[PDB]
Design a protein around this motif. Structure first.
Motif, PDB file in Angstrom:
ATOM      1  N   UNK A  55      87.555  35.670  48.226  1.00 44.81           N
ATOM      2  CA  UNK A  55      88.105  35.869  46.895  1.00 44.81           C
ATOM      3  C   UNK A  55      88.975  37.108  46.873  1.00 44.81           C
ATOM      4  N   UNK A  56      88.502  38.149  47.545  1.00 39.69           N
ATOM      5  CA  UNK A  56      89.180  39.435  47.612  1.00 39.69           C
ATOM      6  C   UNK A  56      89.671  39.742  49.025  1.00 39.69           C
ATOM      7  N   UNK A  57      90.643  38.956  49.496  1.00 35.30           N
ATOM      8  CA  UNK A  57      91.183  39.120  50.843  1.00 35.30           C
ATOM      9  C   UNK A  57      91.274  40.585  51.219  1.00 35.30           C
ATOM     10  N   UNK A  58      90.633  40.969  52.316  1.00 33.00           N
ATOM     11  CA  UNK A  58      90.683  42.367  52.723  1.00 33.00           C
ATOM     12  C   UNK A  58      92.105  42.783  53.071  1.00 33.00           C
ATOM     13  N   UNK A  59      92.390  44.080  52.973  1.00 28.24           N
ATOM     14  CA  UNK A  59      93.724  44.592  53.277  1.00 28.24           C
ATOM     15  C   UNK A  59      93.894  44.906  54.753  1.00 28.24           C
TER      16      UNK A  59
ATOM     17  N   UNK B 244      98.231  36.736  53.678  1.00 23.61           N
ATOM     18  CA  UNK B 244      98.482  37.735  52.638  1.00 23.61           C
ATOM     19  C   UNK B 244      99.011  39.026  53.270  1.00 23.61           C
ATOM     20  N   UNK B 245      99.699  38.841  54.397  1.00 20.84           N
ATOM     21  CA  UNK B 245     100.355  39.887  55.183  1.00 20.84           C
ATOM     22  C   UNK B 245      99.521  41.056  55.721  1.00 20.84           C
ATOM     23  N   UNK B 246      98.195  40.954  55.670  1.00 21.36           N
ATOM     24  CA  UNK B 246      97.337  42.031  56.179  1.00 21.36           C
ATOM     25  C   UNK B 246      97.223  41.960  57.702  1.00 21.36           C
ATOM     26  N   UNK B 247      97.449  43.089  58.388  1.00 21.66           N
ATOM     27  CA  UNK B 247      97.380  43.152  59.847  1.00 21.66           C
ATOM     28  C   UNK B 247      95.992  42.984  60.442  1.00 21.66           C
ATOM     29  N   UNK B 248      95.952  42.401  61.635  1.00 24.76           N
ATOM     30  CA  UNK B 248      94.708  42.210  62.366  1.00 24.76           C
ATOM     31  C   UNK B 248      94.802  43.146  63.569  1.00 24.76           C
ATOM     32  N   UNK B 249      94.013  44.211  63.540  1.00 23.79           N
ATOM     33  CA  UNK B 249      94.029  45.218  64.592  1.00 23.79           C
ATOM     34  C   UNK B 249      93.309  44.836  65.895  1.00 23.79           C
ATOM     35  N   UNK B 250      94.088  44.711  66.969  1.00 21.32           N
ATOM     36  CA  UNK B 250      93.581  44.386  68.304  1.00 21.32           C
ATOM     37  C   UNK B 250      94.099  45.477  69.216  1.00 21.32           C
TER      38      UNK B 250
ATOM     39  N   UNK C  98      92.203  49.917  52.797  1.00 20.01           N
ATOM     40  CA  UNK C  98      91.706  49.945  51.434  1.00 20.01           C
ATOM     41  C   UNK C  98      90.472  49.067  51.411  1.00 20.01           C
ATOM     42  N   UNK C  99      90.612  47.887  52.005  1.00 21.75           N
ATOM     43  CA  UNK C  99      89.560  46.873  52.100  1.00 21.75           C
ATOM     44  C   UNK C  99      89.557  46.523  53.575  1.00 21.75           C
ATOM     45  N   UNK C 100      88.525  46.898  54.313  1.00 22.89           N
ATOM     46  CA  UNK C 100      88.518  46.603  55.747  1.00 22.89           C
ATOM     47  C   UNK C 100      87.398  45.664  56.204  1.00 22.89           C
ATOM     48  N   UNK C 101      87.780  44.535  56.795  1.00 24.22           N
ATOM     49  CA  UNK C 101      86.812  43.544  57.258  1.00 24.22           C
ATOM     50  C   UNK C 101      86.762  43.389  58.778  1.00 24.22           C
TER      51      UNK C 101
ATOM     52  N   UNK D  63      83.202  26.086  50.042  1.00 24.63           N
ATOM     53  CA  UNK D  63      83.393  24.654  50.326  1.00 24.63           C
ATOM     54  C   UNK D  63      83.964  24.316  51.714  1.00 24.63           C
ATOM     55  N   UNK D  64      83.640  23.126  52.218  1.00 24.77           N
ATOM     56  CA  UNK D  64      84.129  22.706  53.523  1.00 24.77           C
ATOM     57  C   UNK D  64      85.633  22.553  53.517  1.00 24.77           C
ATOM     58  N   UNK D  65      86.253  23.006  54.599  1.00 25.99           N
ATOM     59  CA  UNK D  65      87.693  22.927  54.714  1.00 25.99           C
ATOM     60  C   UNK D  65      88.278  24.020  53.852  1.00 25.99           C
ATOM     61  N   UNK D  66      87.759  25.231  54.022  1.00 28.01           N
ATOM     62  CA  UNK D  66      88.221  26.361  53.234  1.00 28.01           C
ATOM     63  C   UNK D  66      87.699  27.667  53.826  1.00 28.01           C
ATOM     64  N   UNK D  67      88.425  28.759  53.590  1.00 28.68           N
ATOM     65  CA  UNK D  67      88.033  30.048  54.132  1.00 28.68           C
ATOM     66  C   UNK D  67      89.028  30.417  55.212  1.00 28.68           C
ATOM     67  N   UNK D  68      89.211  31.708  55.470  1.00 28.53           N
ATOM     68  CA  UNK D  68      90.181  32.162  56.461  1.00 28.53           C
ATOM     69  C   UNK D  68      89.597  32.522  57.811  1.00 28.53           C
TER      70      UNK D  68
END
Length: 268
Positions: free
Chosen positions: A240-244, A22-28, A155-158, A185-190
């Motif tokens: 459900x609410x993919x963080x930004x 969903x194009x949200x950056x992963x800060x490393x 906005x939404x930080x995980x 459920x199994x076989x699901x989630x990011x």
């Protein structure tokens, strides 16, 4: 007008995720241009909030290490209000804060960790939403090791617990009982996020907390109790609410060496 390309360059850490579907950056480390970002946010005069909860044994063993390091490393160069929620206003230390910092302590019936979602929301509505643009909620038994800056604002930080490469969602410790609201459920989630840290804007963090407390309640009201308390529900929520914005494991590390930028000691 801030472009993701103004401060972020994913091609700086090829061996890791830097962009989620969903194009949200992963800060490393090394992917963010904090200098650019400090210039940017300074022109808007933003204030960052941080809410830490310390009860019983934690106040003596952790609250101080937290605040001290949070003062030296958290959003340096920006106004920051520290929200201290404790069960005993007297055991809590009062360290000296630096420029642009202030605290606000509140007493809470030590009636659990899941019940924290409720208090956090109650205050965002009561006052936090008016005093800060962003808000981070953290576990007290942590210690900042290096600058935790505005490159973490969103906005939404995980927070990512860990990472590998394509990880098979089946081996994440999500909640698997369908009777739970934290159910994934199994076989699901990011990814599998840590509850130890998560933030965003007061409005967004109010949805995060309001959503979890309700789910925690349902399971409370069904005799069932999600596997990893808050962490279950919180990881069900960012599903459900993919963080930004996602922060790498280098912002909540359990061990101690590499470039942690914050360490989770969790009872020694």
């Amino acid at each position: 007008k801030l472009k993701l390309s103004d401060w972020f360059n994913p091609f700086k850490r090829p061996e890791v995720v830097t962009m989620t579907k969903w194009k949200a950056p992963v800060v490393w480390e090394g992917t963010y241009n904090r200098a650019v970002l400090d210039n940017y946010y300074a022109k808007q005069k933003i204030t960052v909030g941080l809410t830490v909860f310390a009860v019983g044994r934690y106040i003596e063993h952790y609250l101080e290490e937290f605040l001290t390091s949070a003062n030296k490393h958290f959003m340096v160069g920006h106004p920051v209000i520290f929200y201290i929620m404790v069960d005993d206003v007297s055991r809590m230390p009062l360290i000296e804060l630096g420029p642009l910092r202030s605290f606000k302590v509140f007493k809470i019936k030590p009636e659990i960790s899941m019940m924290r979602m409720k208090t956090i929301g109650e205050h965002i509505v009561a006052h936090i939403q008016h005093e800060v643009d962003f808000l981070f909620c953290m576990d007290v038994d942590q210690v900042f090791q290096d600058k935790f800056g505005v490159e973490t604002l969103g906005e939404s930080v995980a927070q990512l617990q860990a990472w590998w490469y394509k990880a098979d969602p089946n081996d994440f410790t999500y909640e698997r009982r369908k009777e739970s609201a934290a159910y994934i459920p199994f076989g699901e989630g990011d990814f599998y996020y840590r509850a130890a840290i998560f933030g965003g804007t007061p409005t967004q963090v109010l949805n995060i907390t309001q959503e979890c407390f309700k789910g925690i309640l349902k399971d409370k009201k069904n005799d069932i109790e999600a596997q990893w308390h808050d962490e279950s529900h919180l990881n069900k929520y960012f599903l459900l609410n993919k963080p930004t914005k996602i922060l790498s494991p280098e912002y909540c590390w359990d061990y101690h060496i590499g470039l942690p930028a914050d360490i989770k000691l969790v009872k020694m």
